[PDB]
Design a protein around this ligand. Structure first.
Ligand SMILES: [K+]
Ligand SMILES: [K+]
Ligand SMILES: [K+]
Ligand SMILES: [K+]
Ligand SMILES: [K+]
Ligand SMILES: [K+]
Ligand SMILES: [K+]
Ligand SMILES: [Mg+2]
Ligand SMILES: [Mg+2]
Ligand SMILES: [Mg+2]
Ligand SMILES: [Mg+2]
Ligand SMILES: [Mg+2]
Ligand SMILES: [Mg+2]
Ligand SMILES: [Mg+2]
Ligand SMILES: [Mg+2]
Ligand SMILES: [Mg+2]
Ligand SMILES: [Mg+2]
Ligand SMILES: [Mg+2]
Ligand SMILES: [Mg+2]
Ligand SMILES: [Mg+2]
Ligand SMILES: [Mg+2]
Ligand SMILES: [Mg+2]
Ligand SMILES: [Mg+2]
Ligand SMILES: [Mg+2]
Ligand SMILES: [Mg+2]
Ligand SMILES: [Mg+2]
Ligand SMILES: [Mg+2]
Ligand SMILES: [Mg+2]
Ligand SMILES: [Mg+2]
Ligand SMILES: [Mg+2]
Lengths: 142, 54, 127, 175, 73
RNA sequence: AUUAGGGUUCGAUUCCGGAGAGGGAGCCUGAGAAAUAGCUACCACUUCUACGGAGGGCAGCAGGCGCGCAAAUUGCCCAAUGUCAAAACAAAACGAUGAGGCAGCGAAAAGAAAUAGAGUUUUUCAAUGGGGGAUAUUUAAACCCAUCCAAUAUCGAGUAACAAUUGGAGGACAAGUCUGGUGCCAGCACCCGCGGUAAUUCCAGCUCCAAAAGCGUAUAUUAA
């Protein structure tokens, strides 16, 4: 009542499944170059950039806070993004024109938490891990 | 207003680490836990029950 | 514990006579129950010569000894040549260098290659 | 490049990390047999699953199938030779009933303790690692050595240990 | 095969029909292939007849077979 | 790779087949080449020069520079495995070989395994490696492994400072209604949600939990 069943009907079944797979959002995103062209990392897991300025982003309701973020320009393709500086007081380790390493935020391009439109995170500055500076296991060079 | 970054971290009174003798490592540590939970001292079981207070 | 002296016992296996190279080849196994360390290979040479009644201990060659884990044993390989002349003819140069009589080392291969490439630019008496 | 030496894996982690019942059952075994880490238990799990998977395949085939005859006798022979099953058990259906403690009993660490050469299962572990135990005149320092039934009666102190004719704290005390 | 066309001079097109099996769906497809065959004047095949052909050396850009026997209708 | 079964996905990379030597054509020799550590020309780059002229091709092995999130030594040797060839090895008398092999660097990944043990009323016993060495062994020569600390004759654990880490403790999900600080701030939080003066969630101290010489994070992909 819903499927063809004939013994010699393999061509119908093959074309049926091929057509309906484009309706799966996950499958389509994997077999189309539109997502990669709009992805600033270009398919990589990390990227390097230069800090342009420090900015503050307000949290979404019902939370209330100022989230410390940074605007960086990527070296490989000269694109501008906004990245989050995670831990407490870690904004003081970052200065303008510093070189930073950026990673994703864990949801494959989706925004995370109460931070509006932020999907990137700072993990390393001036060739030393940011979390290591927070724990004072290393000192900022220069 | 980015001037308040690190407010609580720098405001916390500093408490030093307390020196204590070391714990056994490896197979000895597993032996220690086995005797604490079973064997010694034979309902709900509490692993980190705390003293009362308010 | 009973303090004793040091004594070794030797056995052979997979014996074969090789007339094409004027020698006999076999596997040598030595048991040293109370030895302090590893038995030097020259000592095994003397015992093997005595056991197989060879006129000169210099015509037996031994190499490649592995000590069994746990101690008390060692296994290797041995060759008994028919005479001293045959040994000096059929033996690899590195093995006879261990026994005393061998050619010296030729100069470093890098130096030879440099001279060879320089001479490729010339012709006649210059080369 | 151009190296053809093979290697593989022997253990797998459980797929529910924090299960209260499983955690307690495993802490029982670590204390009872004196193991070092959970990885030693999970190693035994993989061997049992390989045996049980093979048995299920053979029991599907008809009895007179040639592969069932050759493989069935081979796996039963291995179980008897290592003491996993007693010789009364002859049919291939009894291998499906093997459990984790059945294999842990045959470790060298627990064999020497039950043989009387050690005061405790933790005393047995250090003795093996310190080159005091020999199996058929061969020093063994691997606690996970699985002893065969025909080799049980050959376990004794090594001949180079102080405990049996060795000594070729006392050595440093007298100087 | 079966004769498909007889419009060239001393050359015919034959067609072979067969069923191809798709493992995933456990079912079959219909497919066909075409070949160009040299036809000797000793035969007079018509569209729809069945022929037996044999392999030979290359005779043109596309011809690799010769007609050996004709079974009428 | 993943796994009830059916499937989904990866395969530049050791073996087999194809193609190329900056780009693009053309060709001589030769049994065999449209050859590039062969030749000829053009294009793009580029080196020496007494200015007349003459040279170059690392997607071979080491090395540089750039590029990037991203990948080792300008090492030793033909001892083994092979190739070439006028050639067995030796004797005045040692063929070449960055193919290949051996070491250095190397927490990609895989296997084994220390950081104590036994007692007596908080002190007593043994045992052993990490390490230092050796008549020596291994090796082309070294190195690692293995053997030993007298065979007449050979160093060494008590805070055994020879001192284990990485993440967590409302729920999913194993584990504190502890004690200070902060007061919708600073911050946490993959999701639900905490924080506005008594915070089970932030910053710390104690205690506890999980895996353990390993453990977090990001991005892909398989199961779910
Ligand atoms: K013709
Ligand atoms: K190179
Ligand atoms: K060679
Ligand atoms: K190497
Ligand atoms: K390892
Ligand atoms: K010692
Ligand atoms: K509090
Ligand atoms: Mg391939
Ligand atoms: Mg490519
Ligand atoms: Mg190839
Ligand atoms: Mg070519
Ligand atoms: Mg190039
Ligand atoms: Mg020729
Ligand atoms: Mg060419
Ligand atoms: Mg070249
Ligand atoms: Mg001039
Ligand atoms: Mg060129
Ligand atoms: Mg790397
Ligand atoms: Mg010669
Ligand atoms: Mg090389
Ligand atoms: Mg090479
Ligand atoms: Mg340590
Ligand atoms: Mg040592
Ligand atoms: Mg080696
Ligand atoms: Mg806390
Ligand atoms: Mg719980
Ligand atoms: Mg996550
Ligand atoms: Mg308070
Ligand atoms: Mg939580
Ligand atoms: Mg899937």
């Amino acid at each position: 009542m819903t499927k063809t069943n004939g013994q010699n009907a393999a061509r119908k079944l093959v074309r049926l499944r091929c057509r309906n797979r484009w309706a799966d959002k996950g499958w389509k995103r994997a077999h189309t170059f539109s997502a990669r062209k709009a992805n600033p990392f270009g398919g990589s897991s990390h990227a390097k950039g230069i800090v342009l300025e420090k900015i503050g982003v307000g949290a979404k309701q019902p939370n209330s806070a100022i989230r410390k973020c940074v605007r960086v320009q990527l070296i490989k393709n000269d694109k501008k993004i906004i990245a989050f500086v995670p831990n407490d007081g870690c904004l003081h380790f970052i200065e303008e024109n510093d070189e930073v390493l950026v990673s994703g935020f864990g949801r494959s391009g989706h925004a995370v938490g109460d931070i509006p439109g932020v999907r990137f995170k700072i993990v390393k500055v001036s060739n030393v891990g940011l979390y290591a500076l927070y724990r004072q296991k290393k000192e900022k060079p220069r | 207003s980015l001037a308040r970054a690190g407010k609580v971290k720098n405001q916390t009174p500093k408490v030093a680490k307390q020196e204590k003798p070391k714990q056994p490592r490896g197979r000895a540590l597993k032996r220690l836990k086995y005797t604490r939970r079973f064997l010694s001292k034979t309902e709900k079981v509490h692993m980190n029950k705390q003293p009362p207070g308010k | 514990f009973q303090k004793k002296k040091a004594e070794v016992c030797i056995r052979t296996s997979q014996f074969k006579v090789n007339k094409l190279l004027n020698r006999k080849q076999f596997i040598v196994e030595v048991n040293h129950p109370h030895w302090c360390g590893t038995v030097p290979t020259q000592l095994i040479r003397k015992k093997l010569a005595t056991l197989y009644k060879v006129p000169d201990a210099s015509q037996v060659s031994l190499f490649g000894f592995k000590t069994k884990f746990g101690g008390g044993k060692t296994t290797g390989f041995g060759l008994i040549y028919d005479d001293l002349a045959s040994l000096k003819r059929f033996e690899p140069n590195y093995r006879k260098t261990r026994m005393g009589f061998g050619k010296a080392r030729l100069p470093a291969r890098k130096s030879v290659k440099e001279r060879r490439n320089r001479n490729k630019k010339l012709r006649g008496k210059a080369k | 490049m151009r190296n053809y030496n093979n290697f593989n894996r022997v253990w797998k982690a459980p797929r529910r990390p924090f299960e209260k019942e499983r955690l307690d059952r495993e802490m029982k075994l670590c204390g009872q047999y004196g193991l070092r880490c959970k990885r030693e238990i999970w190693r035994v799990n993989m061997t049992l699953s390989k045996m049980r998977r093979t048995a299920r395949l053979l029991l599907t085939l008809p009895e007179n199938h040639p592969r069932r005859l050759l493989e069935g006798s081979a796996i039963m022979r291995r179980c008897h030779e290592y003491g996993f099953l007693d010789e009364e058990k002859d049919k291939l259906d009894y291998v499906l009933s093997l459990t984790v403690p059945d294999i842990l009993e045959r470790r060298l660490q627990t064999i020497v303790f039950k043989a009387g050469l050690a005061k405790s299962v933790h005393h047995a572990r250090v003795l093996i690692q310190q080159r005091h135990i020999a199996v058929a005149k061969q020093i063994v320092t691997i606690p996970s050595f699985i002893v065969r039934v025909s080799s049980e009666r050959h376990i004794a102190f090594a001949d180079a240990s102080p405990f049996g004719n060795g000594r070729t704290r006392a050595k440093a005390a007298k100087r | 095969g079966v004769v498909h066309s007889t419009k060239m001079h001393r050359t015919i097109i034959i067609r072979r029909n067969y069923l191809h099996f798709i493992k995933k769906y456990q079912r079959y497809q219909k497919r066909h292939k075409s070949l160009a065959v040299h036809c000797s004047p000793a035969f007079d095949p018509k569209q729809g007849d069945e022929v037996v052909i044999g392999q030979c050396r290359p005779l043109s850009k596309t011809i690799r077979y010769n007609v050996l026997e004709v079974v009428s209708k």
